[PDB]
Amino acid sequence: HHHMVTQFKTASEFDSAIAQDKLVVVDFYATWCGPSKMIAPMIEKFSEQYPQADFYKLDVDELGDVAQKNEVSAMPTLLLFKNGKEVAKVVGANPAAIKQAIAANA
Numbered sequence: 290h291h292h293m294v295t296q297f298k299t300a301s302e303f304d305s306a307i308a309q310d311k312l313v314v315v316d317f318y319a320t321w322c323g324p325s326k327m328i329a330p331m332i333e334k335f336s337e338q339y340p341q342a343d344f345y346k347l348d349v350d351e352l353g354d355v356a357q358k359n360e361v362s363a364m365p366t367l368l369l370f371k372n373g374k375e376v377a378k379v380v381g382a383n384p385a386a387i388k389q390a391i392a393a394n395a
């Protein structure tokens with residue numbers, strides 16, 4: 290499918306998206322951080338394997354409010370939510386950790 294990873298544009302968009310009754314996966318990244326830019330293509334592959342989960346990316350330098358509120362400091366950080374509730378966090382570009390956190394909750 291096309292359009293599987295959406296880029297967040299406001300804090301309010303994030304707050305709404307994470308409230309969904311499904312797993313919502315959010316890639317927190319920064320363009321100056323290479324390791325963090327590696328999460329996008331990985332998440333693109335995972336989104337097709339777990340289409341029942343929603344996938345998003347968030348540039349912390351555009352949406353620093355969301356980063357601070359969710360206590361994200363290290364780039365990349367993947368945060369996983371279900372029903373407004375954080376169910377997992379994976380810091381760093383760690384494909385197996387991220388995939389299994391997804392598979393557990395999707």
Ligand SMILES: N[C@H](CCC(=O)N[C@@H](CS)C(=O)NCC(=O)O)C(=O)O
Binds near residue numbers: 321324
């Ligand atoms: N996880 C590191 C790269 C990730 C990294 O060095 N992140 C830096 C920027 S690319 C960072 O967010 N440091 C923040 C901190 O002080 O916790 C790796 O093994 O390649």
